Amino acid sequence: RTIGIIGAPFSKGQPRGGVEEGPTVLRKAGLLEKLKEQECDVKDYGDLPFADIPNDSPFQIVKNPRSVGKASEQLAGKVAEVKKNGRISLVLGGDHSLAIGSISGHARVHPDLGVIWVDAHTDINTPLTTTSGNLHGQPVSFLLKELKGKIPDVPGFSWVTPCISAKDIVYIGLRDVDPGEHYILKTLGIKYFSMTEVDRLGIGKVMEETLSYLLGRKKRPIHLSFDVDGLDPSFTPATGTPVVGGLTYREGLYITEEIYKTGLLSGLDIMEVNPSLGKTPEEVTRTVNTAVAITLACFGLAREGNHKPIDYLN
Amino acid sequence: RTIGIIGAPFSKGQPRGGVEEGPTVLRKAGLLEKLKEQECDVKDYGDLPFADIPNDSPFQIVKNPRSVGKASEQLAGKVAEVKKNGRISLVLGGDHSLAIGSISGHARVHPDLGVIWVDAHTDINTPLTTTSGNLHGQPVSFLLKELKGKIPDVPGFSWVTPCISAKDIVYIGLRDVDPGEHYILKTLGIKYFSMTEVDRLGIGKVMEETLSYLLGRKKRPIHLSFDVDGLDPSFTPATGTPVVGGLTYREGLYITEEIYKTGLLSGLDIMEVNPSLGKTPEEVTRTVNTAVAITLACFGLAREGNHKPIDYLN
Amino acid sequence: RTIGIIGAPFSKGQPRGGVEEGPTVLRKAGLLEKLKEQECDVKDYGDLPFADIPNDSPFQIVKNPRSVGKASEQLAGKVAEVKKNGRISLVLGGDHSLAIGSISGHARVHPDLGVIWVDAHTDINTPLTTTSGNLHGQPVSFLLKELKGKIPDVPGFSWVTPCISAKDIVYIGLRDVDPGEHYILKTLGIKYFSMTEVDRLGIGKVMEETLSYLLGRKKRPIHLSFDVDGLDPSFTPATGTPVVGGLTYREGLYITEEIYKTGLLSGLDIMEVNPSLGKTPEEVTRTVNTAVAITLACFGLAREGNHKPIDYLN
Ligand SMILES: [Co+2]
Ligand SMILES: [Co+2]
Ligand SMILES: [Co+2]
Ligand SMILES: [Co+2]
Ligand SMILES: [Co+2]
Ligand SMILES: [Co+2]
Predict the structure, then answer these.
(1) Which positions in this protein are listed as binding substrate (chains A, B, C)?
(2) Strand partners, C293
(3) d(Cα C246, Cα C252) in Å, to the nearest integer?
(4) Which end of chain C is least crowded, N or C, by CB within 10 Å?
(5) Catalytic residue at C227?
(6) For chain B, first and last CA: distance in Å?
(7) Burial of B99: CB neighbours in 10 Å, binned 0-12, 13-18, 19+
(8) Please, which residues have CB within 8 angstroms of residue C37's CB and are 6 or more apart in sequence?
(9) Cβ–Cβ below 8 Å for B194 and C306
(10) Please, where are the H alpha helices in A263-305?
(11) Alpha-carbon span B84 to B108, nearest angstrom
């Protein structure tokens, strides 16, 4: 597959710093080289310089609003750029708040995109339902057309325009949802597969349905937002908001191997990897390594093996 | 849901002490408060004072017979009491031998109850088939109507009267069954799902069947006996009789989430949590925390989220 | 079941030494006694003395060719011997290269055998596709009739004669396959269930199919080649070529419990257990213990329990 790598060292969508190092440790882990080791055409668009916004007091309850909306606005234009270059945008990031810019920059070029959101959280709190004020748990509320009119005018998000509808998104791996978030899920009839559904059906069926759900009517470009906390902390420990009972390494690879096989992946996000939150250097590499394997899977790496269109027996 | 909490600090059903601390660490973990944090009506009936029985020599091979039968007799009347108060009895306990009193006190008020027994063991040894003599591995043999006439007159259990039939109980999670126990399973045609069946069918089907099995004919009150050793020791390490290859955290939550959804849970047991057997203070909290989540699930806590009958968007 | 135990302390099929201790730690773990504890008729044929071959320079890229082909030749005749004694051959070994001798010695007496290969690797590299040269990753290429004419004349393997066809083998647990290996899989139409298929279908279906695949047409003798690295390293850490995302303890027991139930197991291999590669003495026992349980399962040990044809209630 042909990628467009976008480094996004940002963290103002949540409290803990160090998630801005994600693009760094991932690159160092050798991700770009491992991609080229496959049938991949890779172009690094560099790491986005998210300049400081010293004057960014809270907006009611929302924290660092101007800083957040800015990094998303900057990211959206970059993602749009690479999609214009006929390349799958790989946004290696910090916190999940950057999903607003990615999905927005993606939809500008591909207004018919479908979104798959692998996460332990729905991150669909409104600036009015959020109890923490951290924007990495509200990205979705900003992107839904149905919620347009419920979201306040937050400093830094004037450029924003709801690009996705409730029936164009699927959630997978949910196990920590707030009440208001749950009310939004049921009311707008959003399709999701919480860990309960995963245990019930199996990841194979869950994926069968998810794909049938988002591509049944017709084929469309897929945007995969992967929050590393969707996977169990025994696999991705170094992350800010971990939650026990997560998707397994295998389930994570299965999800992505299946996504790849559709040949419709056009947008990818690898979020919440925070090297600093690892209790041991092994938890940091265990996280990063897990984060890389998921990415590679997105672009062709299959557990049953891979081979070029040649005769290996000669 | 509306509960009736019953603390049961008992341990004479097995060798290791410290399981009598279970009600204590569970309460301290904040279980009662977490229940009220939900749509729960909670009434604490206190911790039962299980006075000593200094004169309790063995009965053939059975250990502490008078002490055991006594704590069960005391518990049975308490459970009956709370069920008379229209409340689901939550028996936080020590060893599993206390199941005799719970299920008995439950059936007095609800003679048509169905039993689900999540455990790594069938605990159906008779005082005559038991090779260890520990009563926390024989509770079931005392409660079956079909085995009435095979069980000797053990000091402390004269009050006992078999209240459940072989076709009213389902086992889930079996992986360590004695030969005599197995002979009883097959001979009385008891329905069970050992880890083998779980791996084969999946926990979703296993539950589908279990419920269809116990409620198909008609709806009846359910009594859930949960032995914390049914779950894998990587989740509930601090327990006396651990066994590898147990149910997963997720499978445990799935089982209970499904039980809750029937709206027929009327009796619950949280057994074998022994703080003292933890190799680290983290194994103790990992166990207790796991023990709490399972309880909460029984009363409504759903992984996909929860919300009150209000308009969260206002 | 009735077994013929064959100790195979060999390691020249791979770089790390210490895997030759496998038969030792397994025996010490009490495997032979645990088998007799069941309905098993056990005869220990001792540990094969694999004399050194000081003069064994590489053959092109292949390492220790003369040493390897020799231990396989010796093992083949032993396996043939025990199968002639109407006994299931249990080859406790070192590296997986010994599969060549086992499957060969097995087929001499049972030319219609079916092979199930539980491994993280297909070990089907040819001396010409192998990039490492380690023979414990090529055993299969030596045994396939379809590859006869592609394999060079390697010093030590003149006695060898391809006894199995591509449609008589099933792979389970694959997650690390080389490109040439993958080309051979697809080209010869070999049936396999990589971890992807396991996650998709479940281990219950995977086994359903595997068995239907190898026994559908007619019943035939089964040879189970179990590489301990097929299971996840969290279960079998002390092994040379570990790979994350492996089969679970439960899945491993399920596979074998199912194999046993066919009543067609005639050949078994327990390979790659290397005590020396354990980071802790607990990783060594965790591996060995896991290795034993799998063996016992092969011969009747069922998680739901076991009982003799007697009346336990008397
Ligand atoms: Co999350
Ligand atoms: Co998120
Ligand atoms: Co138990
Ligand atoms: Co029990
Ligand atoms: Co292997
Ligand atoms: Co192997």
Answers:
(1) 121-125, 132-134, 178, 241, 272
(2) none
(3) 10
(4) C
(5) yes
(6) 26
(7) buried
(8) none
(9) no
(10) 281-298
(11) 10
Ligand nearest to the backbone CA of C137: 6
Among all chains, which residue has been given the structure tokens 């028996």?
A: B91
B159 touches chain C (CB under 8 A): no
Q: Do C184 and A313 touch (CB under 8 A)?
A: yes
Task: Give C82: exposed, middle or buried? Use CB within 10 Å, 0-12, 13-18, 19+.
Answer: buried
Q: Report long-range pairs for C137-141 (Cβ below 8 Å, ≥24 apart).
A: C137/C14, C137/C96, C137/C241, C138/C62, C138/C97, C139/C13, C139/C96, C139/C97, C139/C98, C139/C99, C139/C100, C139/C103, C140/C99, C140/C169, C141/C184
Cβ of residue C302 closer than 8 Å to a chain B Cβ? yes
Contact C251 B129 (CB under 8 A): no
What is the domain class of A1-314 according to CATH? alpha beta
* Cα separation, A212 vs C41, whole angstroms: 53
| Cβ of residue C280 closer than 8 Å to a chain B Cβ | no
Resolution to 1 decimal place, in Å: 2.1
Q: Which residues, at least 6 apart from A21, have a Cβ–Cβ distance to it below 8 Å?
A: A9, A274, A275, A276
Spell out the residues 6+ positions from residue B124 whose beta carbon is closer than 8 angstroms to its own: B138, B140, B141, B144, B181, B184, B185
Instruction: Give dist(CA B244, CA B229) in Å, integer.
Output: 9
Q: What angle do CA B165, B166, B170 make, to 5 degrees?
A: 115
CB distance C195–A251 less than 8 Å?
Answer: no
**Token match 């992107």: residue?**
A143
- Both tokens assigned to B154: 């053990």
In sequence order, which residues have a C-beta less than 8 Å from that of residue C257 and are 6 or more positions away?
B196, C297, C301, C302, C303
Residues of B annotated as catalytic are 96, 119, 121, 123, 136, 227, 229, 272
* Residue tagged active-site, from C56, C123, C197, C269: C123
Two structure tokens written together for C91: 């080859």
Residue C269, SS3 per DSSP: strand
**Residues forming beta bridges with residue B170, ordered by sequence position:** B116, B191
Region of C302 (left: φ > 0; alpha: ψ -120 to 50; beta: rest) is beta
Contact C47, C8 (CB under 8 A): yes
DSSP three-state, residue C81:
helix
B10: nearest Cα among B92, B90, B115, B82 = B92
Q: How far is the CA of C133 from the centre of ligand 6 (A)?
A: 14
Please count the CA atoms within 13 angstroms of the CA of B122 that sit on its side-chain side. 32
CA B115 to CA B188: how far, in whole Å? Answer: 15
Tokens of C258: 């199912």
How far is residue A303's CA from residue C233's CA, in Å, rounded to a whole number?
16
Q: How was this structure determined?
A: X-ray
Contacts of B200 (CB under 8 A, 6+ apart): C202, C203, C204, C254
Beta-carbon separation of C202 and A203 below 8 A:
no
Distance, in angstroms, between A233 CA and closest chain C CA? 15
Ligand showing the shortest atom-to-Cα distance for residue C95: 6
Nearest to A182 by CA among B306, C146, C230: B306
Q: What is the gyration radius of the CA atoms in chain C, in angstroms? A: 18
- Are the Cβ atoms of C196 and A307 closer than 8 angstroms? no
Which among C203, C251, C305 has the least Cβ separation from residue B185?
A: C305
Helices marked H in chain C: 22-28, 31-36, 65-84, 99-109, 139-143, 179-187, 195-201, 203-215, 249-262, 281-298
Token reading at B204: 């979703």
- Dist. CA A127–CA A31, nearest whole Å: 35
Beta strands in A119-218 (DSSP E): 169-174, 191-194
Catalytic residues of A, by residue number, are 96, 119, 121, 123, 136, 227, 229, 272
Residue A221, C-beta contacts closer than 8 angstroms, at least 6 positions apart: A106, A110, A112, A113, A114, A264, A266, A267
Residues of A with Cβ-Cβ distance to B250 under 8 angstroms: 195, 198-199, 245
